Design an enzyme around this catalytic site. Structure first.
Site, PDB file in Angstrom:
ATOM      1  N   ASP A  69       0.684  -1.194   0.125  1.00  0.00           N
ATOM      2  CA  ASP A  69       0.082  -0.082  -0.052  1.00  0.00           C
ATOM      3  C   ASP A  69       0.894   1.402   0.169  1.00  0.00           C
ATOM      4  O   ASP A  69       0.506   2.199   0.786  1.00  0.00           O
ATOM      5  CB  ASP A  69      -0.758   0.028   1.253  1.00  0.00           C
ATOM      6  CG  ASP A  69      -2.236   0.863   1.142  1.00  0.00           C
ATOM      7  OD1 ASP A  69      -2.425   1.340  -0.029  1.00  0.00           O
ATOM      8  OD2 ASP A  69      -2.864   1.131   2.168  1.00  0.00           O
TER       9      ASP A  69
ATOM     10  N   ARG B   4      -0.753   9.152   0.871  1.00  0.00           N
ATOM     11  CA  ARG B   4      -1.525   9.126   1.823  1.00  0.00           C
ATOM     12  C   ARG B   4      -1.022   8.558   3.117  1.00  0.00           C
ATOM     13  O   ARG B   4      -1.360   8.626   4.329  1.00  0.00           O
ATOM     14  CB  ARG B   4      -2.893   8.285   1.499  1.00  0.00           C
ATOM     15  CG  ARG B   4      -2.819   6.901   1.257  1.00  0.00           C
ATOM     16  CD  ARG B   4      -4.217   6.072   1.340  1.00  0.00           C
ATOM     17  NE  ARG B   4      -4.025   4.968   0.608  1.00  0.00           N
ATOM     18  CZ  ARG B   4      -3.990   4.715  -0.822  1.00  0.00           C
ATOM     19  NH1 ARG B   4      -4.241   5.612  -1.468  1.00  0.00           N
ATOM     20  NH2 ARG B   4      -3.604   3.318  -1.334  1.00  0.00           N
TER      21      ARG B   4
ATOM     22  N   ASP C 276       2.403   4.054   7.434  1.00  0.00           N
ATOM     23  CA  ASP C 276       1.241   3.334   7.905  1.00  0.00           C
ATOM     24  C   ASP C 276       1.403   1.958   7.361  1.00  0.00           C
ATOM     25  O   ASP C 276       1.850   1.802   6.092  1.00  0.00           O
ATOM     26  CB  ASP C 276       0.202   3.855   6.973  1.00  0.00           C
ATOM     27  CG  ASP C 276      -1.111   3.296   7.577  1.00  0.00           C
ATOM     28  OD1 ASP C 276      -1.402   2.223   7.039  1.00  0.00           O
ATOM     29  OD2 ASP C 276      -1.891   3.778   8.455  1.00  0.00           O
TER      30      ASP C 276
END
Length: 255
Positions: free
Chosen positions: A133, A137, A151
């Site tokens: 991912d 963001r 993240d």
């Protein structure tokens, strides 16, 4: 012992949204440091064993890594409501940062951020860890000259083989990194805007790619295009990307 007693944490303002719940800044009144600034990840529905487990797994994952451009885990509170206590990157999410500072941020800074990320990703590659991912963001800004991977379906970021066959490899990570580099050079605009997720793969198979961002050095777009080779085996690895980004950054800084 990464368990932190709740009374040692002062929950402050909400800084942003997160996958499982809002993220707050706060203060950790710790033995090492009586007022440590921290980020606190929260988890709504953490009463659900299933949700708690997925949420807390990112802390386990984060604990495995030690790199200057990967956010560090500080601790966890594993009684409801479950919190993950993390290093605070005080300038927040990369996308909002790039959008707000669109006309303050010079090209050298954008290239630095791609380089710093390639540095983190080369490290993860060195440990045979596949992220799955990589996108703007999921990057945080710790200082004007320092970003961190923050993240541990995003169709518009995903390699063709990931969309088609749910396959994720070091090679699919490079594809996603290509898109992230594009995001940074676009000052935080999302890829494929106005396109439905279902139509994305058709256009990739047709050989279409995100265009060269305005003011992007041709050396850099060329690197992006190599990241988007349809055949995963033709994509560069992060050691080459890092080397090349370093050279590009220097050229940019010299003039």
């Amino acid at each position: 012992d990464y368990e932190i007693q709740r009374e040692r944490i002062e929950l402050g303002r909400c800084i942003g949204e997160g996958q499982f719940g809002d993220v707050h800044q706060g203060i950790y009144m710790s033995p090492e440091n009586p007022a440590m600034a921290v980020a606190i990840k929260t988890c709504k529905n953490c009463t659900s064993d299933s949700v708690r487990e997925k949420f807390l797994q990112e802390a386990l994952t984060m604990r495995q890594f030690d790199h200057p451009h990967i956010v560090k885990l500080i601790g966890v509170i594993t009684e409801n409501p479950v919190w993950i206590i993390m290093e605070l990157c005080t300038l927040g999410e990369l996308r909002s940062f790039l959008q707000v500072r669109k006309f303050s941020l010079d090209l050298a800074s954008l290239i630095l951020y791609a380089y710093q990320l390639s540095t983190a990703l080369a490290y993860l590659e060195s440990k045979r860890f596949v992220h799955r991912d990589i996108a703007a963001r999921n990057v945080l800004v710790s200082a004007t000259d320092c970003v961190k991977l923050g993240d541990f379906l995003p169709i518009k970021w995903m390699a063709p083989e990931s969309i088609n066959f749910r396959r994720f490899t070091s090679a699919s990570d490079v594809w996603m990194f290509g898109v992230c580099m594009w995001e940074i050079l676009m000052h935080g605009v999302k890829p494929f805007q106005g396109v439905k997720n279902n139509d994305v793969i058709g256009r990739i198979e047709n050989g279409e790619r995100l265009p060269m961002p305005p003011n992007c050095p041709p050396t850099l777009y060329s690197l992006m295009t190599k990241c988007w080779a349809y055949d995963p085996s033709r994509r560069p690895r992060f050691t080459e990307l890092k080397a090349q980004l370093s050279t590009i950054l220097e050229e940019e800084k010299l003039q």
